[PDB]
Structure formats: structure tokens, C-alpha cells
Amino acid sequence: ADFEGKTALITGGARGMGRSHAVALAEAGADIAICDRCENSDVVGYPLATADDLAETVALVEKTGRRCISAKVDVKDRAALESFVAEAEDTLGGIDIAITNAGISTIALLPEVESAQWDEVIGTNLTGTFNTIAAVAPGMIKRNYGRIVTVSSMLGHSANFAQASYVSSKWGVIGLTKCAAHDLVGYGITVNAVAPGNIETPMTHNDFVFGTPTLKDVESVFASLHLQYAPFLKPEEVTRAVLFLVDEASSHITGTVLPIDAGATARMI
Amino acid sequence: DFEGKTALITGGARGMGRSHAVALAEAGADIAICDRCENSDVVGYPLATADDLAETVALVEKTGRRCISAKVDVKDRAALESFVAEAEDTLGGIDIAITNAGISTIALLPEVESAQWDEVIGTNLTGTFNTIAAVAPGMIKRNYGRIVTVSSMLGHSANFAQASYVSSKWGVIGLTKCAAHDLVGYGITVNAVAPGNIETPMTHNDFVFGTMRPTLKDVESVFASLHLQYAPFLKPEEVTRAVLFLVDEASSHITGTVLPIDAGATARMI
Amino acid sequence: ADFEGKTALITGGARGMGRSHAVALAEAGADIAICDRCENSDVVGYPLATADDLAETVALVEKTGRRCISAKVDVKDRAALESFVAEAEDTLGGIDIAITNAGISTIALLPEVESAQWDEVIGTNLTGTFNTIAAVAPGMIKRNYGRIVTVSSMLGHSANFAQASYVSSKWGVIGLTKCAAHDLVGYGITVNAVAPGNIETPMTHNDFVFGKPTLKDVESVFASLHLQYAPFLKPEEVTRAVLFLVDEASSHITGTVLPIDAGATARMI
């Protein structure tokens, strides 16, 4: 079992990719700590995860036979993350693997992007990643082991219309990934990013995103973003890149960005 | 060259912001400059003073141009917005904007203090967003703008102890390219300059010299290593000329780009 | 922006961008050496320059007051270039500025790309650039001064369908640029690339490429490659970026790639 006797922390673990990552790590043998904000944002048009979503991930992780701990945590809140990390380090015996998956997407054109919306997207997606790295690194340093995977986007090395907040945060995540990779280099820690294309999760599959109306009605616009026919990839397709990077054998892969985007990267760098 | 045009420069009190302002003034633009004019508790070197800002105003005026200034924190969107309105009432609509206000810090993860992260992200990235958001309505209305953001050599690389600064300068590029999309159909371009080591009070000060080793000569080797060519520091005017190239009316079809002025550091990378 | 006392070499100087660069450098005070193969190629579907084309550019340069030398030279022939450089040392005082502009475009899908076509595109566009830098470098080292501008493309940092040969050569040119920037760094020489988008020249404005098929018929297809709604830019828009780079005051800009691509670069790195 590849990951037996490891422990993983996944932020935004209540649904979508975060649940996917937690469940696959659990199946391969890791104990799991998941957290999620479990509430809506006024500046986000689609519903975020709920308390029941989170319990369901816990139930799915436990079904594999692993230990799981969970908590309602806003990654913007550094003290809150640090407290939950302390619990996990003590309940599960140190955190080996951190996935900074918590994140939000918005659509709004410049100059009419609301400061509160900018704040939340930068805050959750970029500062929340910073807060998560900074929260797990001391334990990984003391243990001279870790694998941190950050989550950027296709949009983390490109750009589109009406995406200033989201794109700025996902570019900064890549910069952040490479710095953490420097600072933690000497302690047996790696830091890499996954950059997904369009993934079928409740971030993209909801009535607000459809509005800006069927799945069938929106597919062509999503498909234009990809080189390959596929309008949406499965969360599992990103999870297997995550698992490749957080393997112990990825000791000398650090500071990298791995795209899972159906050939969108074929168009660019 | 720039006669009849009006340019907004943030962090206009000294350093590269002063150089940009004066060069645009000599070329014929009227200038609107703003600066924080105060220190920050999480930045180890002194920031500009009001006297620095008043100096840039006199330099711009010594060219024959008109100049207005204001004490402004670019983290404050509403402050920027009122200063834009202030500027246009006096000098006409803003045609050119340089998002130059910025700060640098040195701190290793995971001992990066949250207030310092907030400050750096806030000034460098959120401040750039606030400046663009401040100027764009009038550029859209007038159907003309040239916006230059300021990233860094570190905006497309990374180094030790620079998480806040590097994350911000990466952010600036993605923002630049985004602003280049939303603004595209209104005759507005948005490009970044990415300077290497530049001789300004950001780099030339005791705090930076102390932390990198204390005199100029003792820190030259450290700064030289970052460049491919031998020159430890470049003149701010070397960045300014890149700015002027990009904000030229003739640059209507250059948008979403990153122009490095980094003494060959970009020869080692993308 | 004054080049009095300087001599500039422009390959593919017979028409299009080379001619644009040659005339503008001459206007700004530079003496000029221009060469072109002046001959069609069997693996390129549109016509290349004629000897009359080259004589026009000589005449256009001389009208500015400058001295000009010209020769029929295929840039794949290193010895021919070196011979033309030697004529430039003897007559014009040696080449201070070089623009490796000579190049060709082809269209063909893998796996049906003919080796003879791959060879000609890599030879002219990639090796031809190498041959030009190698030919002009020794004189620039001897005088401790040089400005070299190579010509890549929006496709030298992206990719598209049916363009393996072209795209590969233009990617290689960017690597070569950054290599030449290294080797020549100690000698007062800079090496930078321009990367144009769709430019109105005889490379794009011809029967073959348009393939009854008029300009107004192809405009929307060319426009889709740009972000701004301009299907083609003028050669002069590329030329002014070249002048910016080869200026004496650009001594500390080296190894860079300057896009002139109407916002294509806004979507990518």
C-alpha cells in the first residue's frame, strides 16, 4: 500500500477534487485530516460545501479503513489552520502530505470587480495557500519529510476575460509554490503545483455557472478551452497527478507545475 | 512625443517612479503622482517622505509640465479613485498609468509574519489591481489607455526567503494579462516591465546591506550573481526607457507582454 | 535613436520585414548590408524574393543618404555569409548590428511532413540564424560592441496544427538567442529576439496561404490568433521594437523575447 503509515492534510476536502484526493489517499493507505469552510460566500455566485458534505467525505475515508479527522476551517484564518494542524499532528502522528486544495472561482470584468470579491479570491486561493504551507511546514521540518501539492489552474499560466481575481491568485500560487520549494528544500520537503483544466466538480457544475440551462447547453464553451474533445475531466484525473507528486519516490521533483488540462498546455507554456 | 497626454504614476516620490515621471514630463506629458509618504513597520528600510514627493513635483515642473501630487496608499481603492477625479479635473483625462508603488521584504517560510504577507500582497498586487480599477473607467470612456504594471525578475522566477514578494510579482503578471483582456476593445493596452537589480532606495540602504552581509562594495558580489552581465545595479532610467517604449501611442498592438530589463538574468530562463 | 557610424546586417532584406528594418535603420543613420537568397524554394508554396526586390531595397536605403552593399546569399550557407560579412568589414567598417530576419513558413500535418520540407525550414529558420550569429560575432568581439536581434514568432512560444517544422525552428531560435546572449556577454554584445504575430508581408499575403479566397475572406481566421481585432499588423510595428533593442542604450537588455502580436501573448507566457 503506497501510502500506508502516512498522514495527509487536504483543505477544501468537503467535496469535488478535495474529496477525490482524500479518498484516493485513504484507499492507498494514508490517514486523513480534512477541513473545509462549510459555508457560502456572499461574493461567490455558486453554493460552497456544507457540514453534511464534509461528514460524507469523512464517511467515505473511514469506509476504506483509515482514521479521519475533520473540522470546519476557513483557510484565510491562519490561527484556525494552525490549531487544526496541531490537532492532526497529535491525533495522527505528524502530517506527511499537504494538499492546499481549498479555493473559489468568480466571474467579473475589470474595472467593475468589487473589492470584497477581489479580497475573498486572493484571500482564499493565494493567502489560504500561504497559510496552509506555513501551518504544516514546522512539523514537516521537525520530521525532515513532506510532500506539499498546491492547486493552481490552466489559468495560472494563461489568462481570459473577466477573471482578474481568479487568475491573479493562481499565478501567485505558482510563484508561492516555487518559493516554498526553496525555503523548505533542506528538510526533505517538496512543493509542487497541479494546474487542472476544466474539471467536473460543483465549482463548475451548478446553476450560477450555467447561467453565466443544461449541461449540454454549456459544453461547447468549456470545450473551447481544451485541445482534446473532452469538455470536462474527472476529478480522479487530477488526483492521480497529485499522487504521483506526493509519492516518497518524488524526492527530487520540486518547484514544478504539472498540468492536467486535456491539451490546453499544448497551446502554450 | 507625449504632448497633450496625462500620466498617473504611483510610488512617484522617488526611485523608479520619479524617473518615469520626469522622463514622461520631458517627453511632453502632464503628470499626476502619488505616494504613501510613510514607513511601514513590516518593511525594514525607510519608504518615501512627503518631502521626497514635493521634490518629484518640482522636477516635473522644471520641465515646463503641470504636476499634481497626493499622499495616497494604493491599498486604498477609494483614495486612488478620488485622486483620479482630482487629477482629471485639473489635468484632463488620464491616458497613461504606471503602477509603480511597491515594497520588498526578506523572510523565510514558515516564519513569515501574516502582517508582512498582507502588506506585500496588499501593496504590490492588490495595489496594482486598485490602480487599474481606478483608471480604467475613464480610459474606457475615452477609448484610450496605456497601462504599465511593474513586476520583477522574481515575477518569473523564485529565490530563498521571498515568498510574499515573489507571490505578489507573479500575481502582477497574471493581472496584467487579465487587464489586457477586459480592456482590449477600448483602445487600452496593459503591459509589465520586469526589472532586475535597480539602484533605488529599495536596494540601496542599510537594512538591505545589513541583511545581505556593511557598505555598497561589500554587497556587490551578492547582487552581481543575480545578473548575467557584470553590472551589480542598473540605472532607473534603463527601466524608464522600456516604460516609454510601451506607453507610446505607436505601441497600440503590444499588449499582455512582460519586458525584462535585467542585465541578462532572463537569458537563463523564460 | 541615432545610428550614425554603425553598420547593420539584415538577412532576408529583399522585401517584407527585412526591408522594413533595413530602411528604418538607414533612416536613423546606419550603413546597411542586406542579403537574400532571391530565389523560390520547391518546398515553400508561396513565391520568395526576386533580385529586383533586393535592388529596390538597395535603392530605398541609398535614397536616405546611407551606403549599402547587397549580395545573393542563402543563410544555410555559413561560408557565403562569412564572405558577405568580410565584404562588410572591407567596405563599411564592420557589422555592429545584425538582424537574423531571413525565414520561411510552411503548412503540413504530421506524419505527412516531407523531410525535405522539415530540412529546409529548420535549415533556413534555425541553422540560418545560427550561421548569421557565428558569422557576425567575431567582428563584434574584436570591437567589443554588438546588437543582435533574432526573429522568432508568436509560434516560437506557443503551438498550432500543421506547423511542426515552423514551430520547432522558432522555439529553437529562442533557445539559441539566450545561448548567444551567454557566450557573447563579456564582449559588449546583446542578443534578443522579437516574436511577431500576424504581419502583413508576402509571407502571409499570397494565393497559397489564403488557400475566390480574398483578404476579407481570411481576415476573421487570422484575427482569431490575435486578441485585438486586427488581422495583420504593419512590418513597421515590428521594426520599432527592433530599433528599441538595437539602440546603444539597450546595453543591459539581453536574452529577452519581445512580442508584437496584438495581445496573443496576453493569453499565455
Next chain:
Amino acid sequence: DFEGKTALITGGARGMGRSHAVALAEAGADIAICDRCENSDVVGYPLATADDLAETVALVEKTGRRCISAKVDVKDRAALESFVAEAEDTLGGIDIAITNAGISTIALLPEVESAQWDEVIGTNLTGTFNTIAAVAPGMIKRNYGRIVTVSSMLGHSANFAQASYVSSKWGVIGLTKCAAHDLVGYGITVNAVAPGNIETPMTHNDFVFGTMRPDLEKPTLKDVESVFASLHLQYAPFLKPEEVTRAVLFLVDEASSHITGTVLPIDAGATARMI
């Protein structure tokens, strides 16, 4: 599980190509491997021999798999096509291709001999082109392929005295993105691995150690470690071929169907400094 899959590996006589060949075999693939098996006039270290290639053949068949081999120069498209048809016939068609054949040289501009430029561009860039061209028709017919090209840390950076090598490796990445375009509709993916300093006979030889540490008449491994290690972020001057092999296996997996046109660095943090 690559059981029932056939992999072509060029440069399979030693180094990373042998590493790829043995791992794919162990994982269930049958193997077609080819190599030049002859030194080059313009490369300063020895290349592989026919006995090297035979060694790889023997090691693969020890795993229980079928293996075919040929002396092939990747610069010769017709020779690659002949070898591919022989593979198609004996082993049922090539599902996976790793374009590993390549060489490195050292020479400062403008003193780069044309003949060295031509060989490096020819083997590294054109030979990758040739390999892609040769295997793609079978992959198209069967509507399945996984192609991995081999660029380098230097395919997205530059250094002194490597114009030939660096131009070739940049070219490879562009070519990779175009093949990904051209072949996308036929169930074929094309990705690059970009290795850092790898312990193979390309780097571990008397010619290479002589360069970097010449002021030093008889340079040993230990005398060169520090200069190689300054190219990496992490301590290790050299990585194992198997560390690249493992990325190769990730990419050529059937499950990697929606990863195409990407460049995967295995470079011990070098990519942490850059893009």
C-alpha cells in the same frame, strides 16, 4: 500494467533508454529498441556499442518479454520506418514511443563547428521528428498512442557554451506541442520529460569531467560533484535514471489520456528557479 503494450525506445543501448526499456518490460510491455552503436566525430565522449545494445536486449528478455533490436541512426528516417515496420510485424504495433536518442556537446559561440551543430540538431531535434513521424501512422490506424520526447532542463533555460544542445532541446518542446496538436484526434498524447543532471555515460565520462575542473589534470567524480550540484536546487549532484523513468511511466500510462503537450521536469529543484 502495460501487459499487451509494445514500446519503442530509441537510444535504448544504455543510460536512460536502457532504464526506460527495462522498467516498461518489467511492467509488462514488449520492447523494440534501437541505437546508433557507433561513436560520433563531433561528440567528445564515447557513445554506445552493439554489445551495449545486446546487453539491454538480454536484460529485457530476462523479464519474460519479447524484444527486437536494430542498429539505427535516428537521423535516418527510412531506417526508423524500416525498424518500425519490423516492430509492427513481429510485436503487433507500437503503442508507446520514447524518443530518448540524443547527444550533448560543449563549444562556445562563434567557434562552434558546423559539423557539430548539424549532428546535434540532427540527432536531438530531427531524430525526434523522425521517430514521431515513423510511429504515428500505426498509432493513428489503431487510434492509440503514448509518445514521450526527451528535452532537458536546458530545453527551458540556457547556459554558456551549449548553443547546439540548447537550441535542439528547445526545438523538442515546440515539436512536442505540435505533435500533440496534429495527433490529438487519434487517441494519441505527446509529452516531454525534462531531466536535470542524470547519472549516465553522457555525463559520467573522462571528456565531461575534463571540462569543468580543467585546472586539475585528472578530475574524479568527487572533483566535479559541486559544479553539477550548483545546477540543481537540492543537494544531489546527480539523479538516478529510474527517477526519470518513473515520470516516463506516469505519462505513457493509459490513464494519462488527457495529459498532452506538457513538459515534466525531473530536475531536483532547478525548475523552482524558473518556468
